[PDB]
Amino acid sequence: MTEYKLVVVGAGGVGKSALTIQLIQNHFVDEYDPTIEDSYRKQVVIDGETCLLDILDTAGQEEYSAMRDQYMRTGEGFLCVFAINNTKSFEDIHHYREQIKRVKDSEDVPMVLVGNKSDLPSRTVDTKQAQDLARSYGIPFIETSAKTRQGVDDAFYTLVREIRKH
Ligand SMILES: Nc1nc2c(ncn2[C@@H]2O[C@H](COP(=O)(O)OP(=O)(O)O)[C@@H](O)[C@H]2O)c(=O)[nH]1
Ligand SMILES: Oc1ccccc1C(=S)N1CCCC1
Ligand SMILES: [Mg+2]
Known part of the structure; x- marks a missing residue:
């Protein structure tokens, strides 16, 4: 009954x-x-407290549209996803984190950094570099595989924990 x-x-x-x-x-x-x-x-029920998740899965190419900024205003938590086999996607995290902190006007926005496709063999983004980035932001970092399911519940639930702590 509380909605995130x-x-x-x-x-x-x-x-x-x-x-x-x-x-x-x-x-x-x-x-x-x-x-x-x-x-x-x-x-879903997380740590035994039921809640409703309302999850926006972003798409499209955007030089920063108004509609995107409106959705960022509404967001309470951000799952910032890169792919461990994609250096550019990792490089983009900086940029998302800047927009998020600008729209919310805050250094302390519930966020979790997610390194996806953890099932894949040719890793190009070092785990330690993601861990360090996450730690410098003061946010959790979770590796996931949407294919394997590895990490998927943990990423979303941890983001909810981040909203709740905050
Ligand atoms: N091997 C693997 N492939 C994935 C994983 N997640 C997504 N993909 C694939 O990578 C491509 C991009 O996924 P998509 O969900 O469309 O990413 P999006 O553009 O961020 O929404 C698709 O071909 C997916 O099947 C994963 O965890 N492991
Ligand atoms: O449903 C949402 C979840 C997170 C942030 C914004 C929204 C809103 S109000 N949206 C309106 C339709 C698509 C997404
Ligand atoms: Mg998509």
Whole structure:
């Protein structure tokens, strides 16, 4: 019955839709439509306290649109996703974290850094570099695989814990 507005951010192709779908529907969709943006609602129990999740899975190319800024205003927590095999996607995290801190006007915005596709063999972003970035932000870092399910509940639930702590 308390509702959390969550926003899933990160470059195209990192797995934002595969994570969100895995969480909601419990399976891995290979090659989900790259171009669709929507919210998904789910009722979950975390640490024994029921809540409603309202999760925006962002899509589209954007030089910073007004509609995106409106959704960032509404967001209560941000899941910032990169892919461990994609150096550019990791480089983009800086930029998301700047926008988030600007829109919310705050250094202390509930956020979790998510390194997705942890099942993949050719890792290009070092775990230690992500851990260090996360630690410098003071936010949790969780490696996930939307394909394996590894980490998926933990990423979203930890973001909820971050809202609740805050
Ligand atoms: N191996 C693997 N592939 C994934 C994973 N997550 C997403 N993908 C694939 O990577 C591509 C991008 O996923 P998508 O969910 O569309 O990412 P989005 O653009 O951020 O929404 C698709 O081909 C997915 O099947 C994962 O955890 N492991
Ligand atoms: O549903 C949401 C979840 C997080 C942030 C914003 C929203 C809103 S109000 N949206 C309106 C329709 C698509 C997303
Ligand atoms: Mg998508």
